[PDB]
Amino acid sequence: QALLRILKETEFKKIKVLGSGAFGTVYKGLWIPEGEKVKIPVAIKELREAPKANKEILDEAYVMASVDNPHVCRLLGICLTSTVQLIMQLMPFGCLLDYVREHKDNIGSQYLLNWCVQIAKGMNYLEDRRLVHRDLAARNVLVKTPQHVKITDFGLAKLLKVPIKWMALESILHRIYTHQSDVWSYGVTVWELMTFGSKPYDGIPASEISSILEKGERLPQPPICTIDVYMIMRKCWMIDADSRPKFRELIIEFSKMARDPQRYLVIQGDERMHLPSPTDSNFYRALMDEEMDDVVDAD
Amino acid sequence: QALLRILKETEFKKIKVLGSGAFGTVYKGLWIPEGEKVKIPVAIKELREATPKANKEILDEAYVMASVDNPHVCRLLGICLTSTVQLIMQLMPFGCLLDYVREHKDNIGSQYLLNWCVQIAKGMNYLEDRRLVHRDLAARNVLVKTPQHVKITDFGLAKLLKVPIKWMALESILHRIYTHQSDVWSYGVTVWELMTFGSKPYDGIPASEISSILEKGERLPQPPICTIDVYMIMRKCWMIDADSRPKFRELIIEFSKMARDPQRYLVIQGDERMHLPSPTDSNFYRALMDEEDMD
Numbered sequence A: 001q002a003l004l005r006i007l008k009e010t011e012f013k014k015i016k017v018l019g020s021g022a023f024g025t026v027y028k029g030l031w032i033p034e035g036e037k038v039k040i041p042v043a044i045k046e047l048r049e050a051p052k053a054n055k056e057i058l059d060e061a062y063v064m065a066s067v068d069n070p071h072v073c074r075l076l077g078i079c080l081t082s083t084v085q086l087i088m089q090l091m092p093f094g095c096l097l098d099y100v101r102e103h104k105d106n107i108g109s110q111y112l113l114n115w116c117v118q119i120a121k122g123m124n125y126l127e128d129r130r131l132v133h134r135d136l137a138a139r140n141v142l143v144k145t146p147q148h149v150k151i152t153d154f155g156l157a158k159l160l161k162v163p164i165k166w167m168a169l170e171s172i173l174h175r176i177y178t179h180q181s182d183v184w185s186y187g188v189t190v191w192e193l194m195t196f197g198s199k200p201y202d203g204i205p206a207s208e209i210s211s212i213l214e215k216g217e218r219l220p221q222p223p224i225c226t227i228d229v230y231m232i233m234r235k236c237w238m239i240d241a242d243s244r245p246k247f248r249e250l251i252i253e254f255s256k257m258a259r260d261p262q263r264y265l266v267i268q269g270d271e272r273m274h275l276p277s278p279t280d281s282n283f284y285r286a287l288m289d290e291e292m293d294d295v296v297d298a299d
Numbered sequence B: 001q002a003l004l005r006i007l008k009e010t011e012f013k014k015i016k017v018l019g020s021g022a023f024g025t026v027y028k029g030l031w032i033p034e035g036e037k038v039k040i041p042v043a044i045k046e047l048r049e050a051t052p053k054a055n056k057e058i059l060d061e062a063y064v065m066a067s068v069d070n071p072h073v074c075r076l077l078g079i080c081l082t083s084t085v086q087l088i089m090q091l092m093p094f095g096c097l098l099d100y101v102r103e104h105k106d107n108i109g110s111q112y113l114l115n116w117c118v119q120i121a122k123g124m125n126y127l128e129d130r131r132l133v134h135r136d137l138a139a140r141n142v143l144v145k146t147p148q149h150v151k152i153t154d155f156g157l158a159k160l161l162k163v164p165i166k167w168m169a170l171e172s173i174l175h176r177i178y179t180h181q182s183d184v185w186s187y188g189v190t191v192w193e194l195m196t197f198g199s200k201p202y203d204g205i206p207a208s209e210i211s212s213i214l215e216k217g218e219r220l221p222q223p224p225i226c227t228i229d230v231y232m233i234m235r236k237c238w239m240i241d242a243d244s245r246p247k248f249r250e251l252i253i254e255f256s257k258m259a260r261d262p263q264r265y266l267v268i269q270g271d272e273r274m275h276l277p278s279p280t281d282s283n284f285y286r287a288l289m290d291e292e293d294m295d
């Protein structure tokens, strides 16, 4: 229980709504430690309801509180008095989807491929712990710093707007959720990144997706992607789940590609869009990211 | 070196005054990374007296200040060189340990007090290892990162430039001699400040007369909560002969020993209840505020 702090409603306040999704509402909030005069910013996710006893939710939460990996967001605290309110670290940069749309004119290959590496690393860790995400998407990758992203919202789908356009075929047709169906979503997430945040299958209703998948139709090749990168996405969307890549294979392949990033993505002005200098990296870490490094560098 | 970031004045803004000291104003500020929309809270120390040529010498010392790497010493992160030199460091919303002990007066337990003494000694020992003399150690110059993790600040500022007479070793008052052993003296005063929950040292005695009473052998008095064993360490910090003062490495051992049996060495009313930090509350503080290597 040492990893999950139980909060009294009297020691935190919700300030502003940050967003809403299939599972609840995320607020920017404050934590006021008892006996202290500081207000510490936190993120608070207030859950919709689905129903289940407080003890069973607490059991679920201890598992979410126990993930230990630089690319997965850990549940920090919980309040079960009224609604279910989860407390986690506030990520001022927001989610990676909004970030890639915001900076579509300034994202280099080194950033894009290193994000693919980090997302695969967080997902491989989840597979190690036998935790199926069920809702991996670019909106559920949080930006700690532009050089450090983290998967969030895993297993909320367990504890309780169905993301049809990210689900593997077997998940749509038969509600089968495995680590290999997470690999399908990972492939859509990579597609979101490489298109700088396009909406997948835009204009196609969700009810049609299973049918266009069965006809063999897939998301198109992003204009910056060489075939090498596009083949990885295709493999994530094979009908046979065991034929799809493994998260650990994805880590290796994207890490390789990150060592020669301009050979695998075609970006105008890429030469001027490198990872930060050592000076700027040291400054970011000291202010926002004291916890991993391991960014893969060119050459 | 890559450990000091040179900032552009357009990159940050001042949003609140936090206090002032002998060398400048400390502000709460906001850092806006270029081309981002986020506002990242920082602390800024604007120095007093407008500086040019000096700026080379300031930088050379800034690079040293930016090279300190220890969980109990604050590292300079960046610098802005305008008509006023502006230093950028991590913001510490709890503030300094002096105000902290005052506001929680007679509500702090012995385990905290003794652990702060260890941590400060570890930080000063690291500086002595680096051959760096602080010159202005005092409880006001220890910041609280979390109640479990304190850090020495303002290393290097004094050299970078009213004298804190009541924290200074006698030889520093008389001869402007500053060594690691004079830092030991100031450490003893800092500890006395903590153990008295933030009392002013030599209250009622003018600063110009401190050196006379020190030479007569007068010293700060024994705090009510301190047993003989704790007070003797403090007294040994204030020996006239600098080389018979404790070394910071010995202070680490002695305070580490006492912090394993805190109630034997500090006698505080209500120590039974106080509040030590559960693993649960400790993990929560670290995840929100303190992800660095130790405390």
Ligand SMILES: Nc1ncnc2c1ncn2[C@@H]1O[C@H](COP(=O)(O)OP(=O)(O)NP(=O)(O)O)[C@@H](O)[C@H]1O
Pocket (backbone or CB within 6 Å): A018, A019, A020, A021, A022, A023, A024, A025, A026, A043, A088, A089, A090, A091, A092, A094, A095, A135, A137, A139, A140, A142, A152, A153, A161
């Ligand atoms: N810890 C956090 N810090 C900062 N922003 C966050 C945090 N968690 C979530 N957000 C933002 O708040 C929004 C709301 O999240 P959420 O309610 O999970 O919806 P979603 O993730 O966008 N879609 P869904 O997949 O249906 O949950 C997210 O899109 C994030 O951009």
Ligand SMILES: Nc1ncnc2c1ncn2[C@@H]1O[C@H](COP(=O)(O)OP(=O)(O)NP(=O)(O)O)[C@@H](O)[C@H]1O
Pocket (backbone or CB within 6 Å): B018, B019, B020, B021, B022, B023, B024, B025, B026, B043, B089, B090, B091, B092, B093, B095, B096, B136, B138, B140, B141, B143, B153, B154, B164
């Ligand atoms: N990084 C920081 N975060 C938060 N508060 C800080 C920080 N650095 C300094 N302060 C506070 O800012 C105020 C001014 O500090 P400062 O100018 O250093 O004067 P001082 O520490 O009180 N005396 P002195 O340092 O000997 O000149 C004090 O209340 C400090 O606690």
Ligand SMILES: [Mg+2]
Pocket (backbone or CB within 6 Å): A021, A139, A140, A152, A153
């Ligand atoms: Mg979400």
Ligand SMILES: [Mg+2]
Pocket (backbone or CB within 6 Å): B021, B140, B141, B153, B154
């Ligand atoms: Mg100071």
